[PDB]
């Protein structure tokens, strides 16, 4: 079966350590790995007034970047499902897993 892993995370160095684990972990336990293809990157934007009272043109424009990566696995062994389930990454990565 196809299982595919959408990794997403606010830090771009933290995410492609967590990718490069998963590309190593699958290849060693016997599988054909696809990707890790870079999807586009939701950048939100918040402008805010900056003074406590008045001064409408004094502002501070923040962003959050959300980086997004996709890793398809085409040939699962019975090991390769459990090798990735048992893995644990940094806190700022969010994994998913469709089936």
């Amino acid at each position: 079966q196809r299982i595919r892993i959408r990794l997403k995370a606010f830090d771009h160095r933290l995410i492609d350590q967590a990718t490069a684990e998963i590309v190593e972990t699958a290849k060693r336990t016997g599988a054909q790995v696809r990707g890790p293809i870079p999807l586009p990157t939701r950048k939100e934007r918040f402008t805010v007034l900056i003074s406590p009272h008045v001064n409408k043109d004094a502002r501070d424009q923040y962003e959050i970047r959300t980086h997004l990566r996709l890793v398809d696995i085409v040939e699962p062994t019975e090991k390769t499902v459990d090798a990735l389930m048992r893995l644990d990454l940094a806190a700022g990565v969010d994994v998913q897993i469709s089936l």
Partner: protein
């Protein structure tokens, strides 16, 4: 804001979860539906008798810290003032100053 006005926005959440979220979400469909009953609504008259602060309309957002009504931001649950204080210490993750 005041302590009274922060207490009022616990009172109005307390209700609207208990009532309308179940019981008025029935009656807003009975007052809607055209292809079932057009005479024994009764429900329009019964929707008044529910306590008035059961409506979610009546809930303002405050900044979950200072209680300020204006300047709200839904992503963070905070006033523009406290967003910025918290941003700059590094307490909101991934948030930095932008430029493009």
């Amino acid at each position: 804001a005041k302590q009274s006005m922060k207490a009022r926005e616990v009172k109005r959440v307390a209700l609207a979860d208990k009532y309308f979220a179940k019981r008025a979400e029935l009656k807003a469909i009975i007052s809607d539906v055209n292809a079932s009953d057009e005479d024994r609504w009764n429900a329009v008259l019964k929707l008044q008798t529910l306590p008035r602060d059961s409506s979610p309309s009546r809930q303002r957002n405050r900044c979950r810290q200072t209680g300020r009504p204006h300047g709200f931001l839904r992503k963070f649950g905070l006033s523009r003032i406290k967003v910025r204080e918290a941003a700059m210490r590094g307490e909101i993750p991934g948030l930095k100053k932008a430029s493009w």
